[PDB]
Write a protein that binds this ligand. Structure first.
Ligand SMILES: *[C@@H]1O[C@H](CO)[C@@H](O[C@@H]2O[C@H](CO)[C@@H](O[C@@H]3O[C@H](CO[C@H]4O[C@H](CO)[C@@H](O)[C@H](O[C@H]5O[C@H](CO)[C@@H](O)[C@H](O)[C@@H]5O)[C@@H]4O)[C@@H](O)[C@H](O[C@H]4O[C@H](CO)[C@@H](O)[C@H](O)[C@@H]4O)[C@@H]3O)[C@H](O)[C@H]2NC(C)=O)[C@H](O)[C@H]1NC(C)=O
Ligand SMILES: *[C@@H]1O[C@H](CO)[C@@H](O[C@@H]2O[C@H](CO)[C@@H](O)[C@H](O)[C@H]2NC(C)=O)[C@H](O)[C@H]1NC(C)=O
Ligand SMILES: *[C@@H]1O[C@H](CO)[C@@H](O[C@@H]2O[C@H](CO)[C@@H](O)[C@H](O)[C@H]2NC(C)=O)[C@H](O)[C@H]1NC(C)=O
Ligand SMILES: *[C@@H]1O[C@H](CO)[C@@H](O[C@@H]2O[C@H](CO)[C@@H](O)[C@H](O)[C@H]2NC(C)=O)[C@H](O)[C@H]1NC(C)=O
Ligand SMILES: *[C@@H]1O[C@H](CO)[C@@H](O[C@@H]2O[C@H](CO)[C@@H](O)[C@H](O)[C@H]2NC(C)=O)[C@H](O)[C@H]1NC(C)=O
Ligand SMILES: *[C@@H]1O[C@H](CO)[C@@H](O[C@@H]2O[C@H](CO)[C@@H](O)[C@H](O)[C@H]2NC(C)=O)[C@H](O)[C@H]1NC(C)=O
Ligand SMILES: [Ca+2]
Ligand SMILES: [Ca+2]
Ligand SMILES: [Ca+2]
Ligand SMILES: [Ca+2]
Ligand SMILES: [Ca+2]
Ligand SMILES: [Cl-]
Ligand SMILES: [Mg+2]
Ligand SMILES: [Mg+2]
Lengths: 1063, 665
């Protein structure tokens, strides 16, 4: 209700798509995207940073890679604080790969304290054709110095022109000697490829080209040398075309090479080209066509110009598998479609990932980004658009990741991922209902009580359709514990907008009404024919969001020309420098910055002087005289500011208009203001903080007909906060729910008493007692009393519930703070002396109410005639208070049921395990201790050896061991009754495991493992025996009490039967 | 019936007080020491006090039809409504036999529909043949769709734009959102030749832009060529569909405006707009009375079936592998459409509530449903719907229409208020109406014998106080001429009323923060909240009835909890919402050991009354999802079994391992 509509900031940039994405940044700027704006040739999307001070927007300078084509920069924005970072993305990058064109995304990570870097860190790569390339260079004597030196520079030039590991190289220098300088495997393993070429020295000697080519074919192209199978095999022969002393001819080795499918390039050195014999030597070596496979040694461009080659991938379009085809993986990923900041790093949502099954990439600094998505097994996730929206959630330490999948089975769903053992894993889901409702389009984590732990995830379904309204927001509390995630309630906008798109945008504005509960803001860009609207929902105790909106702001309400108002939202920061949280709303071609107004609270105190009207007023010879008696009334208005975090706010001037009424509704008013001539008065006074009183003059006629009913004075007021002139005419305002009508009674001219008791209980258990009944007996022994009012005073957890004598009751807060009060006036009734009324007053006791260990209920009693009071007859009674909780321990399903041992296995033993699990099904956190009672001995003989309590899950617990001596009984008789070995007859080993805080719905898993011995059974004289261990929960019994009726579940037991067969 | 006092000053006010109130026009029906608040009461208590049957004023809601047919009748209705009393009139629907049909065949030309295309080219003759067998004036048309021509939906590389098909086949066509092939015509031969020229196309992702096409078909009736007859739109595909919100992947944020965008039989601005919403399409379809027939493959039937919930006049028929059964599909779909008839009303004000009674020739009857629903409607076999209209207020002049979904025929309902009476001295300032004097302004009395401000003497105040211990007019009213005139409070929704001014409309129990749910589900009258139609409760805190307690198959909080006010009341530790699972309960494995032994192994203590001893156990010879159990049997051997819980009290699905664990033994 405190969003300022009249004083408004407007950001207008005529760029295409401006305002489609907004975000608050560094508590300074409103960063705005314009994804359709054409910035450069074959480049789209732009950023604009806007300021409250400037009142204008300036382009954010960013240099964009040339391969980033039409990225739609600013389609999704994200920001965080401490340190302040900005993440601006563009998921529509067109990348040409072969005859395909992929669709990936690019993002820029910005920050004032750091340098701008990009995400993902490296460019998307087109799949390249594998090709294994062998250099074969002539190092014979005919090759000399600068020629041989040139050949190496040719090799260096080539190696630099080919990417890895698409292409790997192998070099062999030949003469009459053969030396492989580096194999394929050596090249691939090489930290730096160029380092290998430094040690190459010419061999001189004769020239054996053919046998060398043979040696290359039968060796350098093999799996043993690191040559890849699918790789296109290319052999570059570098020679001067002079072969001497070779026992082989080309026609002997070349066909063997052709059969291997080896492409050959002939690079000519020196006089190789001009000599007719040396030129034939080149033609023979090179593959056909010869003109395309022969080049000089000086031409470095020659080799690359033909190939920078790719592998042609054939996609499986429309979800249909051809036998040759290949499934979509990350080619259409569109990384950065949505983005959010997490403690461990940024997270970019990639929608098109794996046939649009969606997902998200976590990008920790200087590490391999981990991909987060549904498991491969889940095929229904295809075309679900997972990661369409991304949002962070936190429960205490644990960070979780919520991803939206608005297309899932045409219905849509949201999924929560958390890290389990160094790898991400789905913990919970929640599915929408209506088809095409786009459930999971927008995600918003809400922390209501500001304890740092997320309580409430808001999930948008913008296209949810009903006949009279459209759009929907599902309030989904985090699936804490192991309960399945489900939506607690649902929020709608106002009706009349079937396609209003309520829930398109979601943001947290923070606590704006000062109830210490987080408030949220939801957008509806489609309302009244795509003008748009924005709603404000207050937070609610026991974390939920209020069913009805506190304030709705339509696009038409603010301006004409306004379209799609609310299509983007960002709040929670202060950008108007007044210390109050502000809201940045997106719109078509515009971005509006709205500011929250400071909230004021007004209280009234009204008294009359004198207290009770002297009856000397009405006593006459019947003079027609009136207004002969004057009455003074002291009215005080004190104004406390609710917003305790407002910059400035030292002199808050506030204009108030007072109205007054004397006995309103009555035909003949019994009072008149000395000033006005009637019974109606008005006052206009500028008021500040603290307090401001004022006296008024009342006139009472001499003789009046009604002397029974007290005179009433009704007060109301409107409050218009004066603009502060600092902070640009920002105005305070009265709370919307505030009481405007105040009434004080002036009595006409007894000793009363009060008493009550609590029927049914000596103690109050909170959570188990939702109501409180007090049997109130009031008596009047003395003079008759008029307008008897029965006043109660109690802690905050109590309230007067009216059930179906006649009473009229009203309830309002009193005291320093923390105490409330409910005074119940009784009339229709003259309360005559000696007569007593007994009635049942019922109080609602909150389940979360904190009453401490003591509940004090005090009861006042008063009449219209004000006695001196302090005459006792105010009754207080105290009630001991405990707090309910449901905690269960139970024997797990999987444990050691029995152990079979032959009559000859006395010496031996076997591993036995007992498992218990403890759950908090109550509504209250609680410090519990868990006790484990395990037999380890029987008559100083070993029974259960090396027992150790373990808890792999929740591995931050802490246990101790304590020996026990058994109450010495005749066990042979104790066994004879029932063959059971436990702490009664046997030596026990007590385990205490303390839990400092046992969270609600949290589960604790314990395991008692050890070696169960066989020998001790011979003491028993039974064929089989039961070995029993006991688990028991203990909490502070003075502060807490187990849920009434469920006491038996606080201890559990587990039995392992030792049986002996005979062979 | 029941009548509770509110406004007791006048005749019309007596009727406004309640739907079970009556007013007596007998002059001096009151005694000398009686108030006139006793003139307004229930009909029995009037007769019981001797009020004549002739002079009792009881306006009753009336329905009057001016006849004007035989499909939707009557087409003119005038309703006179008393607040609280429901007027009723009948609507007769008799299905007409020979109304013409325009059938537009919207074909998926995506590459996945390659094998389907061949059969569709032969369809022309057979389609019109079957159509002309159903009704006369048969007309067939054709259109085609693929998807929006941008990534990720379509590979936009110029080479794969010109030839989208994966294999190099030579009979292919570049991608397109929607193309209109043939305007609706009676010529079968045209269809065959024009559709014959159409080639197969292709694109990237599985769901297609079919909804884009349907929206255009509905928005361009002149281009398509619909007559104002019954309209069929056959939607044929093997996959899913894109809807609103999916355009953002192509950086398309502009909503479908639901208008015609055709450039030479083509949807060229397809990339400038987002896919239409299902809610958008449903509205546009229903507005143009275009009934879609979704012909989808087996894998896609359950999905498209969901659309029928949003689109009332639609049907889903399973399409055979190569679209061979398409004709039998259409006729079966048409029967499904024609056999079911919905009766509904256009937009209603907050004052009027309308329910329907459905009397079908099927042999089935529904009572008081928000929409008339009859299935199995046969031709010329008339069904009747009973319309019940109730007004909360005295209402102004209004007209709302009732029509049968699928047809342009309408029933015009006129609504007039009925708050008046037609009723058959007063010492000066009062003129007499309906058995009592209505005094001039500033004057009040049974015969107008007093003045508001004036004398107002003693001993007439004897009637003013409730008893000897009560304050005169409860202190909330002034005593004029023996009776009480209550004070006026400026608090909204607050009114002091009553003979002794002892009642107020503010004091009641609270739901939410407000009184009786505020100005919503209920209004407050002297401690008791009188709830608006459709709601109930003490403070009216519970909402309506039993829908918040159901599992998706309507078993109502499993079998482990009974429902009151949508909050499931379940025993033991079974938690909310549907009372399905008990986390605090002990493991049931222990007690069922004898039942497991008798079921699987014929032995054990329950030998031969196994069926009588185990009423809740249902034996399964295959493994189940339940919890693991293992105990010793009657002879000491270990028996393993698993217990899966079913909806009900102690009802499990048990599986037992045939292998037992003995020691040897
Ligand atoms: C969510 O995201 C995950 C990725 O994190 C998706 O899972 C991946 O799917 C892709 C494609 O469907 C898989 O790629 C294929 O991998 C096989 C060979 O697999 C081997 O190598 C993988 C990479 O090193 C490795 O992950 C594999 O792991 C094995 O062990 C795990 C252990 O759990 C087991 O679950 C797996 O099933 C594996 O057994 C394994 O070591 C490869 O042969 C494929 O290439 C063929 O197909 C291409 C066409 O794409 C074709 O061109 C080739 O010629 C060749 O014929 C292909 O590269 C990847 O292995 C999957 N990764 C995992 C971990 O499962 C998952 O699909 C996403 N969810 C959804 C709902 O889609
Ligand atoms: C990036 O986008 C621009 C504009 O959005 C594209 O430029 C258009 O290209 C088409 C190609 O058929 C031309 O017909 C239009 O005239 C161009 N428009 C303008 C304004 O120049 C560009 O092709 C896109 N780039 C890629 C790689 O697809
Ligand atoms: C005090 O209350 C009275 C009524 O309780 C207000 O009077 C009404 O004011 C509204 C404006 O909000 C007018 O539309 C009504 O016509 C007024 N009614 C009557 C009977 O006067 C009055 O405005 C209130 N005073 C202040 C300062 O808010
Ligand atoms: C603890 O119990 C295990 C049984 O699970 C014992 O394991 C046996 O150890 C002996 C050692 O010589 C081996 O010969 C057996 O083959 C083991 N049994 C199995 C099933 O592998 C172990 O000895 C016990 N520990 C002690 C201290 O007795
Ligand atoms: C509208 O028609 C229905 C059914 O045709 C009528 O309901 C039946 O009325 C007859 C008497 O006319 C009763 O004998 C039947 O028992 C009623 N049906 C049932 C199911 O009880 C209804 O009365 C008609 N209403 C009007 C105003 O004509
Ligand atoms: C099923 O029938 C058997 C007998 O065939 C009943 O067995 C008796 O059980 C009681 C305990 O409830 C024993 O005290 C008796 O000795 C048993 N009788 C016999 C003959 O064995 C059994 O009670 C029946 N169960 C049910 C549920 O009806
Ligand atoms: Ca929290
Ligand atoms: Ca708040
Ligand atoms: Ca601010
Ligand atoms: Ca198909
Ligand atoms: Ca598609
Ligand atoms: Cl040489
Ligand atoms: Mg040489
Ligand atoms: Mg398809």
């Amino acid at each position: 209700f405190n969003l300022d509509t009249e004083e408004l900031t407007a950001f207008r940039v005529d760029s295409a798509g401006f305002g489609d994405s907004v975000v608050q940044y560094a508590n300074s700027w409103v960063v705005v995207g314009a994804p359709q704006k054409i910035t450069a040739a074959d480049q789209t999307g732009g950023l604009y940073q806007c300021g409250y001070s400037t009142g204008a927007c300036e382009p954010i300078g960013l240099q964009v890679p040339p391969e980033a084509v039409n990225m739609s920069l600013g389609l999704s924005l994200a920001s965080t604080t401490s340190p302040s970072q900005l993440l601006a993305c563009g998921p529509t990058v067109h990348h040409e790969c072969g005859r395909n064109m992929y669709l990936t995304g690019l993002c820029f990570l910005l920050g004032p304290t750091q340098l701008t870097q990009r995400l993902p860190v490296s460019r998307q790569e087109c799949p390249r054709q594998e090709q294994d390339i062998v250099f074969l260079i002539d190092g014979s004597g005919s090759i000399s110095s600068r020629n041989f030196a040139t050949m190496m520079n040719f090799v260096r030039a080539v190696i630099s022109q080919f990417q890895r590991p698409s292409t790997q190289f192998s070099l062999m220098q030949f003469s009459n000697k053969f030396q492989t300088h580096f194999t394929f495997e050596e090249f691939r393993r090489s930290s730096n490829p160029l380092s290998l070429l430094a040690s190459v020295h010419q061999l001189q000697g004769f020239t054996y080209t053919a046998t060398a080519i043979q040696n290359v074919v039968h060796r350098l192209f093999h799996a043993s040398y690191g040559a890849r199978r699918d790789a296109a095999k290319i052999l570059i022969v570098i020679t001067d075309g002079k072969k001497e002393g070779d026992s082989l001819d080309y026609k002997d080795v070349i066909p063997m090479a052709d059969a291997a499918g080896i492409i050959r390039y002939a690079i000519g050195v020196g006089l190789a080209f001009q000599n007719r014999n040396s030129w034939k030597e080149l033609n023979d070596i090179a593959s056909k066509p010869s003109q395309e496979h022969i080049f000089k040694v000086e031409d470095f461009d020659a080799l690359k110009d033909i190939q920078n080659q790719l592998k042609e991938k054939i996609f499986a379009i429309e979800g249909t598998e051809t036998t040759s085809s290949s499934s979509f993986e990350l080619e259409m990923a569109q990384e950065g479609f949505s983005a959010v900041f997490t403690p461990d790093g940024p997270v970019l949502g990639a929608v098109g990932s794996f046939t649009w099954s969606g997902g998200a990439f976590l990008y920790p600094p200087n590490m391999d980004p981990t991909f987060i998505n549904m498991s491969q097994e889940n095929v229904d996730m295809r075309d679900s658009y997972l990661g369409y929206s991304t949002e962070l959630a936190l429960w205490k330490g644990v960070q979780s990741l919520v991803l939206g999948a608005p297309r899932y089975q045409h219905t849509g769903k949201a999924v929560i991922f958390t890290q389990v053992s160094r790898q991400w894993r789905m913990k919970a889901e929640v599915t929408g209902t209506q088809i095409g409702s786009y459930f999971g389009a927008s995600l918003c984590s809400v922390d209501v009580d500001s304890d740092g732990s997320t309580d409430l995830v808001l999930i948008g379904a913008p296209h949810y359709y009903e006949q009279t309204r459209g759009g929907q927001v599902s309030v989904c509390p985090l699936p804490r514990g192991w309960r399945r995630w489900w939506c607690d309630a649902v929020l709608y906008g106002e009706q009349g907008h079937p396609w209003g798109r309520f829930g398109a945008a979601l943001t947290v504005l923070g606590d704006v009404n000062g109830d210490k509960l987080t408030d949220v803001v939801i957008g509806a860009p489609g309302e009244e024919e795509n003008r748009g609207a924005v709603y404000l929902f207050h937070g609610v105790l026991g974390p939920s969001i209020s069913p009805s909106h506190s304030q709705r702001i339509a696009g038409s309400q603010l301006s004409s020309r306004l379209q799609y108002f609310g299509q983007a939202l960002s709040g929670g920061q202060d950008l108007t420098q007044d210390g109050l949280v502000d809201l940045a709303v997106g719109a078509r071609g515009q971005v509006l910055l709205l500011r929250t107004r400071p909230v004021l609270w007004v209280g009234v105190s009204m008294q009359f002087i004198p207290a009770e009207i002297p009856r000397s007023a009405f006593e006459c010879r019947e003079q027609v005289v009136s207004e002969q008696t004057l009455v003074q009334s002291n009215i005080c208005l004190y104004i406390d500011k609710r917003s305790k975090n407002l910059l400035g706010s030292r002199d808050l001037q506030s204009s108030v208009t007072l109205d007054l009424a004397l006995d309103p509704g009555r035909l003949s008013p019994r009072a008149t203001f000395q000033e006005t001539k009637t019974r109606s008065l008005s006052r206009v006074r500028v008021l500040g903080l603290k307090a401001h009183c004022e006296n008024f003059n009342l006139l009472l006629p001499s003789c009046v007909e009604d002397s029974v009913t007290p005179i009433t004075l009704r007060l109301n007021f409107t409050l218009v906060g004066k603009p502060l002139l600092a902070f640009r005419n920002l105005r305070p305002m009265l709370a919307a729910d505030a009481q405007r009508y105040f009434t004080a009674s002036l009595p006409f001219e007894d000793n009363l008493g009060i008493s009550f008791s609590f029927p049914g209980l000596k103690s109050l258990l909170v959570g188990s007692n939702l109501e409180l009944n007090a049997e109130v007996m009031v008596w009047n022994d003395g003079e008759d009393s008029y307008g008897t009012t029965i006043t109660f005073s109690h802690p905050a957890g109590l309230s007067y519930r009216y059930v179906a004598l006649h009473l009229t009751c009203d309830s309002a807060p009193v005291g320093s703070q923390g105490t409330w009060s409910t005074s119940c006036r009784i009339n229709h009734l003259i309360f005559r002396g000696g007569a007593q009324i007994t009635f049942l007053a019922t109080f609602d006791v909150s389940p979360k109410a904190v009453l401490g260990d003591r509940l004090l209920l005090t009861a006042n009693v008063s009449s219209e005639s004000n006695t001196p009071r302090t005459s006792k007859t105010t009754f207080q009674l105290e009630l001991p208070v405990k707090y309910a909780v449901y905690t269960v321990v139970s024997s797990h399903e999987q444990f050691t049921k029995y152990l079979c041992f032959s009559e000859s296995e006395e010496k031996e033993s076997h591993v036995a395990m007992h498992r218990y699990q403890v759950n908090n099904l109550g509504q209250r956190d609680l410090p519990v201790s868990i006790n484990f009672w395990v037999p380890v001995e029987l008559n100083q003989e070993a029974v259960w050896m090396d027992v150790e309590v373990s808890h792999p899950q929740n591995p931050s617990l802490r246990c101790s061991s304590e020996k026990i001596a058994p109450p010495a009984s005749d066990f042979l008789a104790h066994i004879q009754k029932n063959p059971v070995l436990d702490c009664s007859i046997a030596g026990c080993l007590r385990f205490r495991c303390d839990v400092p805080s046992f969270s609600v719905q949290e589960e604790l898993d314990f395991t008692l493992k050890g070696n169960l011995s066989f020998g001790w059974v011979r003491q028993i004289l039974q064929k089989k025996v039961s070995v029993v261990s006991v688990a028991e929960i203990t909490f502070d019994t003075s502060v807490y009490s187990q849920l009434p009726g469920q006491e038996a579940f606080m201890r559990a037991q587990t039995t392992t039967v030792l049986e002996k067969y005979k062979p | 019936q029941e009548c509770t006092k509110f406004k007791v000053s006048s005749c019309r006010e007596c009727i406004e007080s309640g739907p079970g109130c009556t007013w007596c026009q007998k002059l001096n029906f009151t005694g000398p020491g009686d108030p006139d608040s006793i003139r307004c009461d229930t009909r029995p208590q009037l007769l019981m006090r001797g009020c004549a049957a002739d002079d009792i004023m009881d306006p009753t809601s009336l329905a009057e039809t001016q006849e004007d047919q035989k499909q939707l009748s009557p087409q003119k209705v005038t309703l006179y409504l008393r607040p609280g009393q429901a007027a009723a009139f009948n609507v007769t629907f008799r299905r007409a036999k020979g109304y013409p049909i325009d059938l537009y065949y919207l074909m998926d030309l995506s590459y996945s529909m390659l094998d389907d295309l061949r059969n569709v080219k032969k369809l022309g003759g057979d389609l019109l043949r079957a159509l002309n067998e159903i009704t006369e004036s048969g007309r067939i048309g054709f259109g085609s769709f693929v998807d929006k021509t941008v990534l990720p939906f379509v590979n936009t590389h110029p080479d794969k734009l010109r030839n989208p098909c994966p294999n190099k086949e030579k009979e292919c066509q570049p991608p397109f959102a929607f193309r209109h092939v043939l305007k609706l015509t009676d010529n079968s031969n045209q269809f065959q030749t024009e559709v014959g020229k159409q080639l197969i196309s292709g694109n990237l992702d599985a769901p297609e832009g079919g909804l884009d096409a349907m929206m255009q078909v509905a928005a361009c009736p002149e281009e398509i060529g619909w007559r104002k007859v019954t309209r069929l739109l056959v939607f044929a595909t093997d996959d899913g569909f894109h809807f609103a919100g999916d355009g953002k992947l192509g950086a398309i944020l502009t909503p479908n405006d639901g208008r015609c965008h055709l450039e030479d039989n083509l949807y060229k601005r397809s990339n400038e707009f987002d896919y239409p919403s299902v809610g958008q399409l449903a509205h546009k379809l229903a507005e143009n009375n275009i009934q879609p027939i979704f012909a989808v493959t087996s894998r896609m039937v359950k999905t498209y079936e969901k659309l029928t919930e949003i689109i009332p006049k639609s049907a889903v028929g399973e399409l055979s592998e190569d679209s061979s059964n398409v004709v039998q599909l259409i006729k079966n779909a048409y029967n499904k459409l024609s056999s079911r008839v919905f009766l509904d009303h256009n937009a209603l004000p907050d004052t009027l509530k309308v329910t329907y009674d459905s009397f079908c020739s099927n042999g089935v009857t529904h009572r008081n449903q928000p929409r008339g629903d009859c299935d199995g409607v046969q031709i010329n076999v008339p069904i009747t719907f009973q319309v019940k209209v109730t007004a909360t207020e005295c209402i102004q002049e209004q007209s709302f229409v009732i029509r049968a979904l699928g047809f342009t025929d309408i029933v015009t309902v006129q609504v007039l208020p009925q708050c008046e009476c037609r009723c058959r001295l007063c010492h000066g300032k009062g003129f007499l109406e309906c058995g009592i004097c209505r005094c001039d302004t500033g004057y009040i009395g049974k015969n107008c014998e007093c003045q508001t401000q004036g004398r107002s003497s003693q001993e007439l105040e004897g009637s003013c106080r409730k008893d000897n211990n009560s304050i005169i007019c409860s202190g909330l009213g002034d005593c004029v001429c023996g009776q009480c005139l209550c004070h006026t409070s400026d608090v909204p929704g607050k009114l002091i009323y009553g003979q002794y001014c002892e009642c107020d409309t503010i004091n009641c129990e609270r739901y939410n923060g407000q009184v009786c749910g505020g100005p919503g589900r209920g209004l407050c009258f002297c401690g008791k909240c009188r709830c608006h139609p459709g709601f109930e409760g003490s403070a009216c805190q519970c909402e309506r009835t039993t829908e918040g307690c159901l599992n998706p198959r309507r078993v109502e909080c499993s079998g482990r909890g009974r429902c009151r006010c949508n909050v499931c009341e379940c025993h033991s530790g079974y938690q909310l919402p549907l009372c399905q699972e008990c986390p605090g309960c002990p493991s049931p494995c222990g007690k069922y050991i004898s039942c497991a032994e008798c079921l699987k192994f014929e032995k054990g203590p329950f030998g031969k009354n196994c069926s009588a001893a185990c009423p809740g156990l249902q034996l399964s010879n295959n493994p189940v999802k339940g919890r693991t159990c293992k105990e010793r049997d009657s002879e000491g051997c270990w028996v393993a079994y698993t217990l899966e819980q079913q909806d009900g009290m102690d009802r499990y699905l048990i599986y037992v391992d045939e292998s037992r664990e003995c020691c040897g033994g």
